[PDB]
Amino acid sequence: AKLDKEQVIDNALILLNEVGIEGLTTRKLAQKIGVEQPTLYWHVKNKRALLDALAETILQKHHHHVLPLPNETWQDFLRNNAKSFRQALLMYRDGGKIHAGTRPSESQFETSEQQLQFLCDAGFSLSQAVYALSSIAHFTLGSVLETQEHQESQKEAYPPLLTQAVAIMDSDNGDAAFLFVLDVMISGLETVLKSAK
């Protein structure tokens, strides 16, 4: 035979970069792979399945700060977790739209479970931990979808502050903005814990 699932997914990651999330189809993956539709069907049963597969495997491949390191404060962890998640979303074309709307995978259960436990052990109620992890994902993803969709935008007279505001944001493709509000999020949450009185 031929097809192991990781080869299929690797071809799918190449295709995503070549044609983007919209033009990525099951039928096109089968072209690139050199195979019939119903042999692909056993690995990836529809487009949704395929996209969920990319979402996961992109994180398996490039999202390595999944867990607090022995020397880390929950502050450190959150920072380095979020940075790692963002570079991982930036790695692929439409990486932000690939992730959006997924839920963590079986391959991510033990670490994601751990991320929440780690936050509960830090002082946070569950809700709080859930909302903080969730929302740092949303923040990061929003940051990445915007900068990705922006530089893909080939369109063809701001006021003073707005001119600088947009200059500042086109400069680093959103880096400093990201790091700053990650930092205010983490101080925000610090104040949540200080709300033990």
Which residues of the chain form contacts with Mg ion (CB under 5 A)? 137
From the list a second copy, Mg ion, ligand TDC, none, partner contacted by residue 11 (C-beta under 5 to 8 A by kind):
none
169 touches ligand TDC (CB under 6 A): yes
> Quick check: 98 binds ligand TDC (CB under 6 A)?
no
Cβ closest to a second copy, residue 6 vs residue 152: 152
Burial of 19 (0-12, 13-18, 19+ CB in 10 A): middle
The secondary structure of the chain in percent helix, strand, coil, rounded to multiples of 5, reads 75, 0, 25
**CA neighbor of 96 nearest in space, from 9, 173, 26:** 173
Number of residues that bind a second copy (CB under 8 A): 74
**Is 28 an interacting residue with respect to a second copy (CB under 8 A)?**
no
- Does residue 155 interact with ligand TDC by CB under 6 A? no
Contact 191, 83 (CB under 8 A): no
**Distance between CA atoms of residues 47 and 25, nearest Å:** 6
Site residues (CB under 8 A) for a second copy, limited to 63-92: none
- Print the binding letters for residues 58-87 with ligand TDC: x by CB under 6 A, - otherwise: -x---x--x--------------xx--x--
